[PDB]
Design an enzyme around this catalytic site. Sequence first.
Site, PDB file in Angstrom:
ATOM      1  N   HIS A 279      34.909  45.908  43.245  1.00  0.00           N
ATOM      2  CA  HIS A 279      35.294  47.137  43.959  1.00  0.00           C
ATOM      3  C   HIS A 279      34.214  47.615  44.941  1.00  0.00           C
ATOM      4  CE1 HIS A 279      37.994  47.378  40.277  1.00  0.00           C
ATOM      5  NE2 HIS A 279      38.822  47.281  41.301  1.00  0.00           N
TER       6      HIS A 279
ATOM      7  N   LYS B 270      36.038  43.946  34.891  1.00  0.00           N
ATOM      8  CA  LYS B 270      35.705  45.145  35.651  1.00  0.00           C
ATOM      9  C   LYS B 270      34.231  45.288  35.989  1.00  0.00           C
ATOM     10  CE  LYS B 270      38.506  47.829  36.712  1.00  0.00           C
ATOM     11  NZ  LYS B 270      39.252  47.926  37.995  1.00  0.00           N
TER      12      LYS B 270
HETATM   13  O1  LIG Z   1      44.746  43.909  40.925  1.00  0.00           O
HETATM   14  C1  LIG Z   1      44.128  44.631  41.775  1.00  0.00           C
HETATM   15  O2  LIG Z   1      44.330  44.582  43.018  1.00  0.00           O
HETATM   16  C2  LIG Z   1      43.067  45.623  41.341  1.00  0.00           C
HETATM   17  N1  LIG Z   1      43.060  45.754  39.889  1.00  0.00           N
HETATM   18  C3  LIG Z   1      42.245  46.499  39.168  1.00  0.00           C
HETATM   19  O3  LIG Z   1      41.384  47.214  39.676  1.00  0.00           O
HETATM   20  C4  LIG Z   1      42.483  46.459  37.722  1.00  0.00           C
HETATM   21  O4  LIG Z   1      43.484  45.826  37.322  1.00  0.00           O
HETATM   22  O5  LIG Z   1      41.735  47.081  36.938  1.00  0.00           O
END
Ligand SMILES: O=C(O)CNC(=O)C(=O)O
EC number: 1.5.1.7
Length: 371
Positions: A94, A75
């Site tokens: 993200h 993350k």
């Molecule tokens: O798998 C994804 O598309 C996004 N996943 C996440 O943000 C997570 O698992 O914490």
Amino acid sequence: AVTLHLRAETKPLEARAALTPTTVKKLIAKGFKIYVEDSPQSTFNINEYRQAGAIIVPAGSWKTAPRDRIIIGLKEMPETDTFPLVHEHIQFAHCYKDQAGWQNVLMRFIKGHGTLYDLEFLENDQGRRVAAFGFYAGFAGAALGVRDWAFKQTHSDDEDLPAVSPYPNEKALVKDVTKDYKEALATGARKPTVLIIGALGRCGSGAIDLLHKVGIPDANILKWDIKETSRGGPFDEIPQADIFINCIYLSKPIAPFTNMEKLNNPNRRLRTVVDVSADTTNPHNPIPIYTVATVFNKPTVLVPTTAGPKLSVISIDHLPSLLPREASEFFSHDLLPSLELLPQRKTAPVWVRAKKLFDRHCARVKRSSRL
Ligand SMILES: O=C(O)CNC(=O)C(=O)O
């Protein structure tokens, strides 16, 4: 030969890991060198990684690691960290969907001449994601759905399903769900009927697996996918089921799967909706009966019906975090073939695609500091 360095997670309560002791053991067998940071919040004990052959190092040691190590984590890093990122990083960052502060995230890499290979965008040559968390999202969603349904059989409407917490392994979760379930049946409740939309995908497979393991008969599961939903909603099968589990993410204008009109009926049997696809940013929710994203500390929200029995939604967007061990094992196993291509990352399309995507998004960032 490549050295990977597994970064301890700093996202609050993030207990999953991008590499598991099993995947570490397999990468070392393939000639990788692997460092793993000691991490109290990880669901894995540091000694598992030690037995797997990892070099154990302090949390945060990636910050001073030689520039040739590939820093892998799951993350985001703290938005309060501002120092340049000099390494190649593998992570969910993200920052490709105009998230608040996305330019700042990329600027850290830009200043450091580092590289981001974003886990959310790693795909095979057919364009399919190489690693995600759908199966355990569905498995955990079904587990909580059964627990809420069971809770409603055994408690008054003035009580809500209490706070849940991550489980150490699948067996432990199945045991808890099964106990709740069996106590519900003791009251005279019948085995629940369950409608799953998206039954054919990973999420649907995971939900079905939980249900089977708990003892829910295959005859009690209505397995819907595009064949059924393409008729267009709302679907009578939703209020007629005891539990409805949604695995399909839909964000375009379209007729809803259900709505308050259809739910406001004394003949409704539906008790629990688990929207595994819950996304608070979704401009067009196909299950428009809730606005709250529920969380582990408060897992359900009331659907404010005017007729029929108490109905609640589970809209947790981090269901895999209920089973961080298995979620990590499946994710890391799915990622492993791509990881094996890291020696070849300058040329291998899976990595080159992710690099070029990084480059493209960086080019969107115009800053005086770059002049
Ligand atoms: O798998 C994804 O598309 C996004 N996943 C996440 O943000 C997570 O698992 O914490």
